[PDB]
Amino acid sequence: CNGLKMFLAALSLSFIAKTLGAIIMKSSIIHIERRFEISSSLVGFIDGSFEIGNLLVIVFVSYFGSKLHRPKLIGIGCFIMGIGGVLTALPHFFMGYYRYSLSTCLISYMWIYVFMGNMLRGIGETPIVPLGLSYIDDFAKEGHSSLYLGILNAIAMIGPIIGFTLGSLFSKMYVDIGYVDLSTIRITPTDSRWVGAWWLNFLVSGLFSIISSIPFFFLPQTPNGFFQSFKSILTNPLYVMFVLLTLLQVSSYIGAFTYVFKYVEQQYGQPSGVITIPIFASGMFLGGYIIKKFKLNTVGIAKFSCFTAVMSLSFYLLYFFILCENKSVAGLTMTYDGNNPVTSHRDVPLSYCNSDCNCDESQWEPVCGNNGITYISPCLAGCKSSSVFYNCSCLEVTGLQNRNYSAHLGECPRDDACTRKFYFFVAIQVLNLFFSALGGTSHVMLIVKIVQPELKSLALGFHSMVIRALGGILAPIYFGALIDTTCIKWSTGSCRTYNSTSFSRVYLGLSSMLRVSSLVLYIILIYAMKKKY
Amino acid sequence: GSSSQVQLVESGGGLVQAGGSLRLSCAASGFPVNLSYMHWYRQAPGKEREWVAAISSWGWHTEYADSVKGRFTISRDNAKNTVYLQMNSLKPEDTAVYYCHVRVGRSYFGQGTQVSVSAG
Numbered sequence: 001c002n003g004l005k006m007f008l009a010a011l012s013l014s015f016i017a018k019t020l021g022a023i024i025m026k027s028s029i030i031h032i033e034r035r036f037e038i039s040s041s042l043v044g045f046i047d048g049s050f051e052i053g054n055l056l057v058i059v060f061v062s063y064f065g066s067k068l069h070r071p072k073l074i075g076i077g078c079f080i081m082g083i084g085g086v087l088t089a090l091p092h093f094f095m096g097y098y099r100y101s102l103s104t105c106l107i108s109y110m111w112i113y114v115f116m117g118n119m120l121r122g123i124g125e126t127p128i129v130p131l132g133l134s135y136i137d138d139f140a141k142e143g144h145s146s147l148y149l150g151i152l153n154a155i156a157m158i159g160p161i162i163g164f165t166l167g168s169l170f171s172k173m174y175v176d177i178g179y180v181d182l183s184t185i186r187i188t189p190t191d192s193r194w195v196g197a198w199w200l201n202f203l204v205s206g207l208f209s210i211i212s213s214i215p216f217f218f219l220p221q222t223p224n225g226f227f228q229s230f231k232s233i234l235t236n237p238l239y240v241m242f243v244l245l246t247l248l249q250v251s252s253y254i255g256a257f258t259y260v261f262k263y264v265e266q267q268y269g270q271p272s273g274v275i276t277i278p279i280f281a282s283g284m285f286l287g288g289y290i291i292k293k294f295k296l297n298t299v300g301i302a303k304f305s306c307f308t309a310v311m312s313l314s315f316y317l318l319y320f321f322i323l324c325e326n327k328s329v330a331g332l333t334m335t336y337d338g339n340n341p342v343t344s345h346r347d348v349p350l351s352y353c354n355s356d357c358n359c360d361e362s363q364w365e366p367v368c369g370n371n372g373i374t375y376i377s378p379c380l381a382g383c384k385s386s387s388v389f390y391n392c393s394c395l396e397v398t399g400l401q402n403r404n405y406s407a408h409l410g411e412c413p414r415d416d417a418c419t420r421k422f423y424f425f426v427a428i429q430v431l432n433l434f435f436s437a438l439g440g441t442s443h444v445m446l447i448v449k450i451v452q453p454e455l456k457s458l459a460l461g462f463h464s465m466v467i468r469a470l471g472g473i474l475a476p477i478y479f480g481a482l483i484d485t486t487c488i489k490w491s492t493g494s495c496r497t498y499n500s501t502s503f504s505r506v507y508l509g510l511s512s513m514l515r516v517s518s519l520v521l522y523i524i525l526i527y528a529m530k531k532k533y
Numbered sequence: 534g535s536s537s538q539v540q541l542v543e544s545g546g547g548l549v550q551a552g553g554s555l556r557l558s559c560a561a562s563g564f565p566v567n568l569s570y571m572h573w574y575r576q577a578p579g580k581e582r583e584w585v586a587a588i589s590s591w592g593w594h595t596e597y598a599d600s601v602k603g604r605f606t607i608s609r610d611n612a613k614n615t616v617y618l619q620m621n622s623l624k625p626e627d628t629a630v631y632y633c634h635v636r637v638g639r640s641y642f643g644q645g646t647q648v649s650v651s652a653g
């Protein structure tokens with residue numbers, strides 16, 4: 001510990017703190033919805049409060065904080081994050097006791113505090129990445145800041161592990177722990193009225209941020225115009241090219257990793273990271289190691305990041321050839337009788353087998369029979385008696401008497417040919433995660449060398465605004481819009497099933513085009529750097 | 534507000550005749566109770582703690598039980614720091630002792646007064 005290593009330890013602890021807090025916000029939002037009895041637009045607005053608070057002031061704090069005492073301001077931001085977590089846990093402490101109280105064929109204002117501390121957490125997230133990493137760069141020795149950045153991004157993945165374990169553990173217990181005798185609660189954690197101890201999650205997050213706040217305040221400053229500088233950032237063509245590039249690439253990353261589980265469910269039929277976390281943590285540290293040990297300059301780091309994204313997209317193009325066959329669903333892609341396909345999935349005709357008993361056509365109760373054809377309800381499958389479902393008459397046979405019953409409930413799994421293709425899919429996603437982590441620190445590491453040395457904090461703040469705004473918010477919105485234009489059964493809400501060929505084509509091809517655009521901008525950007533340098 | 538704990542005392546309880554009207558009061562002393570909800574519970578003999586009513590910090594939220602609805606009205610005064618409960622059009626099934634609940638830090642309850650209702 002030569003003075004600087006103490007700062008890297010404290011900054012790694014703060015990275016764990018903020019990445020823990022993000023997972024706690026993502027995990028304990030359903031319990032807040034059940035406890036506060038708030039609507040979907042309201043809980044989305046509370047969820048977006050963090051982005052509002054961060055995106056309002058991130059450029060101003062990153063600009064005005066570089067000339068000031070940087071570790072003290074990082075500690076102040078960590079303390080504001082802890083106060084926001086404590087304030088988010090605060091409305092539980094003074095509300096009181098929480099209160100909570102087969103489709104057969106027929107032949108109030110306390111949420112503001114949870115809002116407000118979340119905004120504080122937004123300011124808590126604000127000075128960590130721009131002011132911290134820049135304070136790394138002017139006083140770490142040359143080549144070493146990539147290694148410290150890879151170490152910090154590897155160490156910060158401990159935070160989601162702590163968040164997942166504490167979230168599951170404190171969601172297993174009741175919200176009124178320590179206040180009521182536990183034998184008096186009649187409901188189970190699987191019930192729809194259960195609320196876990198979300199206040200415990202925000203309490204441990206706030207106290208962890210508060211504990212991480214102290215080691216910043218004892219670090220020294222050194223170990224041994226706004227529009228004018230912001231115009232100087234924006235008028236650099238290499239920087240605005242790199243920011244548009246990284247917007248496209250990170251938007252592809254976010255629009256992929258938001259819907260990986262939905263793609264797995266609607267393609268391979270397997271329902272929705274123990275091994276992937278060592279792969280990611282080794283990949284990011286390996287990226288820092290390759291940048292540090294090989295003595296890469298700025299065009300070298302640009303070429304290395306380009307190479308990693310080329311291998312990532314080379315494995316990403318292979319996902320088109322591992323598609324399973326489409327689901328055999330009666331009433332959406334074919335008619336209910338199983339003889340004639342239908343031209344379009346909107347307002348399909350009814351069949352003569354299921355004309356007789358009138359059930360809900362919009363009801364979704366997935367079953368499949370002996371023949372492997374998925375049926376959408378036991379009313380529309382012809383099944384009149386259930387124990388399994390029996391006497392199903394919407395399955396045409398040429399006198400096969402035994403093929404009239406034995407239909408289980410749920411979406412039964414697909415063939416074993418594409419079950420191996422699912423394992424191929426998971427292996428290629430592991431390789432893509434490894435190469436994305438191998439890219440990793442290069443996005444930050446190019447920015448501090450593109451700009452002037454006294455505008456690195458402003459540049460990192462503006463880039464972080466752009467990535468969290470047009471990549472963190474709008475990119476899942478238009479990915480969800482383009483994905484939901486391929487819905488095949490609308491539940492009156494989110495669609496239950498998708499058209500697997502069309503959904504696969506759109507979800508893969510949008511990220512493919514969005515990646516090849518940044519891959520073209522690689523040749524443009526390295527061409528510009530090689531002309532300049 | 535240097536105090537040990539919050540003490541809650543009920544007032545205005547008394548015997549009624551038929552479907553009359555009661556004027557219940559809950560006075561709190563000690564910590565500042567500007568930010569805390571106050572609830573009213575009942576305790577009928579032979580039955581557990583049933584919940585009756587609640588009031589928010591500033592009185593913007595009034596949440597009630599389904600058993601007594603349209604007749605009980607809860608109200609607050611922040612300056613006197615005292616929660617009132619208007620009761621009217623009663624039945625003798627409402628005969629219980631009424632406890633006042635606040636959770637400034639720890640859950641606090643009152644002594645309670647008999648809100649005994651005669652038959653008429």
Ligand SMILES: CC(C)c1c(C(=O)Nc2ccccc2)c(-c2ccccc2)c(-c2ccc(F)cc2)n1CC[C@@H](O)C[C@@H](O)CC(=O)O
Pocket residue numbers: 018019022125129156157160250253254257273276277280433436467468471472
């Ligand atoms: C959890 C974290 C380390 C992470 C991952 C990741 O490892 N995902 C992961 C998940 C499962 C398995 C394996 C890996 C990805 C991440 C990595 C690769 C691909 C997709 C997401 C990101 C991330 C980076 C930039 C973004 F714009 C958004 C998120 N982030 C957040 C880093 C940082 O940019 C955001 C920070 O400023 C605020 C915060 O910490 O909340």
